[PDB]
Design an enzyme around this catalytic site. Structure first.
Site, PDB file in Angstrom:
ATOM      1  N   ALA A 122      27.272   8.885  59.506  1.00  0.00           N
ATOM      2  CA  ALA A 122      26.075   9.680  59.763  1.00  0.00           C
ATOM      3  C   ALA A 122      25.355   9.385  61.107  1.00  0.00           C
ATOM      4  CB  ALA A 122      25.109   9.529  58.601  1.00  0.00           C
TER       5      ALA A 122
ATOM      6  N   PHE B 246      21.496   8.018  56.706  1.00  0.00           N
ATOM      7  CA  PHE B 246      21.071   7.651  55.364  1.00  0.00           C
ATOM      8  C   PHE B 246      20.284   6.357  55.299  1.00  0.00           C
ATOM      9  CE2 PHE B 246      22.827  10.990  52.829  1.00  0.00           C
ATOM     10  CZ  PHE B 246      23.879  11.483  53.574  1.00  0.00           C
TER      11      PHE B 246
ATOM     12  N   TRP C 188      17.920   7.816  52.621  1.00  0.00           N
ATOM     13  CA  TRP C 188      17.644   6.835  51.560  1.00  0.00           C
ATOM     14  C   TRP C 188      16.445   5.963  51.926  1.00  0.00           C
ATOM     15  CZ3 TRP C 188      19.821  10.061  49.043  1.00  0.00           C
ATOM     16  CH2 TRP C 188      21.199  10.295  48.913  1.00  0.00           C
TER      17      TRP C 188
ATOM     18  N   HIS D 166      33.939  12.308  51.866  1.00  0.00           N
ATOM     19  CA  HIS D 166      32.794  12.599  51.001  1.00  0.00           C
ATOM     20  C   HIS D 166      32.506  14.092  50.870  1.00  0.00           C
ATOM     21  CE1 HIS D 166      31.273   8.278  51.976  1.00  0.00           C
ATOM     22  NE2 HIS D 166      32.430   8.261  51.323  1.00  0.00           N
TER      23      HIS D 166
ATOM     24  N   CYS E 177      39.313  25.771  45.645  1.00  0.00           N
ATOM     25  CA  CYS E 177      39.701  26.413  44.380  1.00  0.00           C
ATOM     26  C   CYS E 177      39.987  25.336  43.354  1.00  0.00           C
ATOM     27  CB  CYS E 177      40.905  27.338  44.561  1.00  0.00           C
ATOM     28  SG  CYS E 177      41.543  28.032  43.004  1.00  0.00           S
TER      29      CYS E 177
ATOM     30  N   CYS F  89      38.794  32.448  44.166  1.00  0.00           N
ATOM     31  CA  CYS F  89      39.937  32.251  45.062  1.00  0.00           C
ATOM     32  C   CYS F  89      40.518  33.618  45.406  1.00  0.00           C
ATOM     33  CB  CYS F  89      40.982  31.355  44.410  1.00  0.00           C
ATOM     34  SG  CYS F  89      42.326  30.872  45.515  1.00  0.00           S
TER      35      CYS F  89
ATOM     36  N   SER G 215      27.224   2.222  58.671  1.00  0.00           N
ATOM     37  CA  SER G 215      26.798   0.886  58.218  1.00  0.00           C
ATOM     38  C   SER G 215      27.914   0.207  57.374  1.00  0.00           C
ATOM     39  CB  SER G 215      25.493   0.976  57.433  1.00  0.00           C
ATOM     40  OG  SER G 215      25.648   1.787  56.284  1.00  0.00           O
TER      41      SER G 215
ATOM     42  N   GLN H  22      22.496  -0.703  63.849  1.00  0.00           N
ATOM     43  CA  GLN H  22      22.097  -1.681  62.835  1.00  0.00           C
ATOM     44  C   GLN H  22      23.248  -2.632  62.562  1.00  0.00           C
ATOM     45  OE1 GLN H  22      21.083   0.934  59.536  1.00  0.00           O
ATOM     46  NE2 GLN H  22      18.927   0.414  59.668  1.00  0.00           N
TER      47      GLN H  22
ATOM     48  N   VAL I  72      25.655   5.626  70.286  1.00  0.00           N
ATOM     49  CA  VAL I  72      27.059   6.035  70.316  1.00  0.00           C
ATOM     50  C   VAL I  72      27.332   7.075  71.451  1.00  0.00           C
ATOM     51  CG1 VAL I  72      26.943   7.746  68.391  1.00  0.00           C
ATOM     52  CG2 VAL I  72      29.103   6.535  68.898  1.00  0.00           C
TER      53      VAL I  72
HETATM   54  N1  LIG Z   1      22.833   7.343  67.857  1.00  0.00           N
HETATM   55  C1  LIG Z   1      23.319   6.270  67.179  1.00  0.00           C
HETATM   56  N2  LIG Z   1      24.190   5.394  67.750  1.00  0.00           N
HETATM   57  C2  LIG Z   1      24.705   4.342  67.074  1.00  0.00           C
HETATM   58  N3  LIG Z   1      24.382   4.066  65.792  1.00  0.00           N
HETATM   59  C3  LIG Z   1      23.520   4.873  65.109  1.00  0.00           C
HETATM   60  C4  LIG Z   1      22.947   6.053  65.761  1.00  0.00           C
HETATM   61  N4  LIG Z   1      22.136   6.649  64.861  1.00  0.00           N
HETATM   62  C5  LIG Z   1      22.209   5.922  63.714  1.00  0.00           C
HETATM   63  N5  LIG Z   1      23.026   4.858  63.884  1.00  0.00           N
HETATM   64  C6  LIG Z   1      23.498   3.907  62.863  1.00  0.00           C
HETATM   65  O1  LIG Z   1      24.494   4.557  62.074  1.00  0.00           O
HETATM   66  C7  LIG Z   1      24.496   3.987  60.771  1.00  0.00           C
HETATM   67  C8  LIG Z   1      24.662   5.077  59.736  1.00  0.00           C
HETATM   68  O2  LIG Z   1      24.889   4.430  58.490  1.00  0.00           O
HETATM   69  P1  LIG Z   1      24.378   5.126  57.154  1.00  0.00           P
HETATM   70  O3  LIG Z   1      23.027   5.756  57.413  1.00  0.00           O
HETATM   71  O4  LIG Z   1      24.549   4.164  56.014  1.00  0.00           O
HETATM   72  O5  LIG Z   1      25.452   6.325  57.042  1.00  0.00           O
HETATM   73  P2  LIG Z   1      26.988   6.140  56.604  1.00  0.00           P
HETATM   74  O6  LIG Z   1      27.772   7.313  57.137  1.00  0.00           O
HETATM   75  O7  LIG Z   1      27.497   4.753  56.883  1.00  0.00           O
HETATM   76  O8  LIG Z   1      26.868   6.326  55.015  1.00  0.00           O
HETATM   77  C9  LIG Z   1      28.048   6.438  54.214  1.00  0.00           C
HETATM   78  C10 LIG Z   1      27.751   7.294  52.983  1.00  0.00           C
HETATM   79  O9  LIG Z   1      26.596   6.797  52.289  1.00  0.00           O
HETATM   80  C11 LIG Z   1      25.770   7.876  51.843  1.00  0.00           C
HETATM   81  O10 LIG Z   1      25.486   7.704  50.450  1.00  0.00           O
HETATM   82  C12 LIG Z   1      26.567   9.150  52.125  1.00  0.00           C
HETATM   83  O11 LIG Z   1      27.463   9.383  51.021  1.00  0.00           O
HETATM   84  C13 LIG Z   1      27.393   8.731  53.330  1.00  0.00           C
HETATM   85  O12 LIG Z   1      28.566   9.539  53.492  1.00  0.00           O
HETATM   86  C14 LIG Z   1      23.177   3.236  60.593  1.00  0.00           C
HETATM   87  O13 LIG Z   1      23.512   1.855  60.396  1.00  0.00           O
HETATM   88  C15 LIG Z   1      22.422   3.448  61.907  1.00  0.00           C
HETATM   89  O14 LIG Z   1      21.908   2.234  62.449  1.00  0.00           O
HETATM   90 ZN   LIG Z   2      43.124  29.331  44.037  1.00  0.00          ZN
END
Ligand SMILES: Nc1ncnc2c1ncn2[C@@H]1O[C@H](COP(=O)(O)OP(=O)(O)OC[C@H]2O[C@H](O)[C@H](O)[C@@H]2O)[C@@H](O)[C@H]1O
Ligand SMILES: [Zn+2]
Length: 285
Positions: A41, A52, A59, A121, A129, A154, A204, A230, A246
């Site tokens: 994310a 998240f 969250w 996810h 379908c 479908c 994360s 983080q 990023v």
């Molecule tokens: N611009 C940026 N550059 C670098 N890091 C960043 C930036 N923006 C945010 N961050 C970091 O990016 C990290 C995002 O981590 P999380 O928020 O846990 O997302 P996930 O994809 O790992 O969550 C996985 C699943 O959990 C859920 O339940 C859903 O099901 C998800 O699919 C943070 O540590 C930010 O510090």
């Molecule tokens: Zn079908």
């Protein structure tokens, strides 16, 4: 139910340390034969979609009795510089596979080849379908979550010794109790295991098995790079830890590789990858 560690303070590498690490990342990309990228994310926050578990994550705000903020709709959101840099890395053959935990549908809409992408996810633009498993990449978000019926059927027609489906179309957004799609997870695990380099971007790594997939590279002798603001769940196993935005890391990496970040001319779906395009020769290092 268990949303893990939320709102942990951000870490920033000093300017000179950041520059040195991106050059080291360029070295690892140049020397590796099989590069697997793992995205979360964090790579879509620059497009106005909250993550998240970041300081203002979905969250994080929910736990603190606040609401997350969206600066865009999912349909009007555009791929970030990072999304477009991953498209170019695949096009020139510097990316073997892409494992994503994002449901925002930006990797597909950026024109990234679906046969080199595992969407563990789900994808909010994709309905499947319930019978034949045929997937439909829509131009608008599928209005349901939790693998519920969407109201559409479908439309796969009759073939030689096979009739029309008319199966129930359901969203691909997994809920907490739902298991990961078998084909996506099997392809993500095979690619991670066979990689000599795994790079995580904006995740994360707190969700299992999704967050453990980059470790499959490390156990087989490969190298692990973690790019995140983080601390992550598997920081101790990383060969290189990059603490920065990023988009800044990927822009500097692309300049080091002598690659331009391609233009995004709107949502486009690419099913299969093509042979690599020409790329600049490698430095001596
Ligand atoms: N611009 C940026 N550059 C670098 N890091 C960043 C930036 N923006 C945010 N961050 C970091 O990016 C990290 C995002 O981590 P999380 O928020 O846990 O997302 P996930 O994809 O790992 O969550 C996985 C699943 O959990 C859920 O339940 C859903 O099901 C998800 O699919 C943070 O540590 C930010 O510090
Ligand atoms: Zn079908």
């Amino acid at each position: 139910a268990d949303k893990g560690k939320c709102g942990l303070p951000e870490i920033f590498d000093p300017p000179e340390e950041l520059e040195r690490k991106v050059w080291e990342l360029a070295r690892l990309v140049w020397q590796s034969s099989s590069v697997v990228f793992h995205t979360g994310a964090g790579i879509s926050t620059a497009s106005g979609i909250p993550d998240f578990r970041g300081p203002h994550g979905v969250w994080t705000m929910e736990e603190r009795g606040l609401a997350p903020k969206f600066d865009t709709t999912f349909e009007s959101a555009r791929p970030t510089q990072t999304h477009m840099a991953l498209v170019q890395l695949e096009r020139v053959g510097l990316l073997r596979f892409l494992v994503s935990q994002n449901v925002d549908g930006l990797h597909v809409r950026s024109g990234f080849p679906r046969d080199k992408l595992a969407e563990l996810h789900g994808n909010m633009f994709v309905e499947e379908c319930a019978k034949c498993k045929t997937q439909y990449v829509r131009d608008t978000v599928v209005g349901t979550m939790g693998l519920k019926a969407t109201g559409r059927l479908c439309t796969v027609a009759k073939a030689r010794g096979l009739r029309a489906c008319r199966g129930e179309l359901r969203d691909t957004i997994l809920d907490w109790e739902d298991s990961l799609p078998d084909r996506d997870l099997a392809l993500a695990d095979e690619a991670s295991r066979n990689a000599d380099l795994s790079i995580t971007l904006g995740t994360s790594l707190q969700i299992r098995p999704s967050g453990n997939l980059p470790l499959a590279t490390k156990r087989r002798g490969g190298r692990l790079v973690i790019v995140n603001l983080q601390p992550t769940k598997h920081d101790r196993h990383a060969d290189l830890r990059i603490h920065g935005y990023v988009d800044e890391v990927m822009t500097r990496l692309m300049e080091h590789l002598g690659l331009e970040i391609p233009a995004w001319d709107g949502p486009r779906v690419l099913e299969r990858a093509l042979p690599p395009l020409p790329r600049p020769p490698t430095p001596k290092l």
